[PDB]
């Protein structure tokens, strides 16, 4: 089955978890086709083992850093040889911040995973990071259509480049994704023909069809208000109010709002570092170049947030390992679960993705997402046998998912903590 994994990283375990060379540098590795954000080219094609054949690279213009002369040595010269570049021109203030890799073995055998950390070294190594790995697939006539295959595909021709469309999707095309049924590819695309974001995933979601309802969004970073006027967060005023039908789709006051969460009792989550949390952190303030949330000069946005919808939490400090310690994660994670502790342990749905808590990745109601996003939704209606899907901590390492904070998390304690202002 598919399975999440904890990326190793070459600070925390100097003596389950993947590495790179895990997914990359196995002789059986015919065929590797990568999306990311940011490319260092020498550090990733250390990774690969010599008897790859093709390494297709998609990626946006000015973020593959090609390898200098004097980093060269025989064997990159011979990978290297093997590598096609598909370049991307974006917009301005837009990212490629898909990252997907989809491999190709001997046996007609094909992979595919979702790492959370774009393919350069720092990247990978210091805030914590997870992968997807999908169930082995087969180049094999398919049968059923397959929904996560459909939406791979309309993502991929999203793209308009005749290059993707020779090159990856002719591939992905033979490949048999039966495997992947229970799953749902939930993306994002700039393209103005193919629709995308959150307008598409509310779509999904009340298609799948009382209690205390919890929804939880970890993220590394978290975007400004939707709108220059008043204060309004992408999840506590829009994503939540659409999934709790509190809106429909033909925003409310900040403070009906409060009201009707009150009385359906709704909780909202987000998680996102601290101040203090890079103190207990092995690297201390080294991973927090990735942790980007700018509310200096709007500071009443954010102390709706912390005050009024009391939305930040934290890691629990004494659950963690002590070779991590209060590390954050990059890797963003957004989830429901319908209590009627052991909140989070079954969830009516989860969503992993590259897509930060952002308009620029989501779009809105009536705006387009500006960015290529990609990520893989669990449903709890969509399940062949469970009903529920399962998620536990990796903290404490048989489950669907599995996530690298806490279980649970601890609300911000209103009295000292402050979430991590990056200009400082």
Not at 68 to 87: P, Q, Y
Not at 306 to 335: C, L
């Amino acid at each position: 089955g598919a399975v999440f994994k904890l990326m190793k990283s070459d600070f925390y375990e100097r003596e389950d978890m993947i590495t790179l060379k895990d997914i990359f540098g196995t002789e059986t590795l015919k065929r590797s086709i990568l999306f990311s954000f940011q490319y260092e080219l020498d550090f990733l094609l250390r990774q690969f083992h010599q008897n790859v054949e093709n390494i297709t690279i998609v990626g946006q213009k000015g973020t593959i850093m090609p390898i200098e002369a004097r980093a060269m040595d025989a064997t990159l010269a011979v990978i290297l040889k093997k590598v096609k570049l598909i370049e991307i021109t974006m917009p301005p203030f837009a990212s490629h911040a898909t990252k997907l890799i989809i491999n190709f073995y001997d046996n007609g055998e094909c992979k595919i995973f979702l790492p959370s950390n774009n393919f350069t070294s720092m990247e990978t190594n210091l805030p914590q990071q997870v992968c997807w790995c999908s169930p082995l697939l087969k180049i094999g006539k398919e049968g059923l259509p397959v929904p996560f295959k459909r939406s791979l595909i309309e993502y991929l021709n999203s793209y308009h480049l005749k290059d993707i469309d020779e090159l990856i999707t002719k591939s992905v095309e033979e490949v048999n994704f039966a495997p992947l049924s229970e799953l749902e590819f939930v993306y994002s695309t700039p393209s103005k023909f193919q629709s995308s974001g959150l307008l598409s995933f509310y779509n999904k979601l009340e298609k799948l069809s009382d209690t205390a309802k919890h929804y939880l969004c970890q993220t590394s970073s978290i975007g400004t208000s939707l709108s220059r006027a008043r204060d309004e967060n992408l999840w506590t005023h829009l994503m939540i109010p659409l999934f709790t039908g509190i809106m429909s789709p033909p925003i409310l006051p900040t403070n009906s709002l409060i009201n009707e969460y009150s009385q359906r009792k709704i909780k909202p989550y987000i998680i996102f570092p601290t101040e203090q949390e890079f103190v207990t952190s092995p690297l201390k303030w080294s991973s927090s170049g990735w942790f980007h949330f700018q509310y200096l000069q709007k500071k009443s946005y954010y102390e709706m947030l912390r005050n009024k919808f009391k939305v930040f939490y934290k890691q629990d400090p004494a659950m963690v390992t002590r070779r991590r310690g209060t590390t954050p994660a990059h890797s963003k994670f957004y989830m429901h679960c319908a209590t009627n502790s052991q909140v989070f342990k079954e969830l009516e749905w989860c969503l992993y993705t590259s897509a930060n808590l952002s308009q620029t990745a989501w779009g809105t109601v009536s705006r387009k997402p500006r960015n290529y996003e990609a990520g893989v939704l669990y449903h709890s209606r969509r399940l062949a046998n469970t009903r529920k899907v399962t998620c536990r901590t990796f903290t404490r390492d048989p489950t669907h998912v599995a996530v690298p904070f806490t279980l649970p998390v601890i609300p911000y304690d209103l009295a000292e903590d402050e979430c991590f202002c990056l200009a400082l």
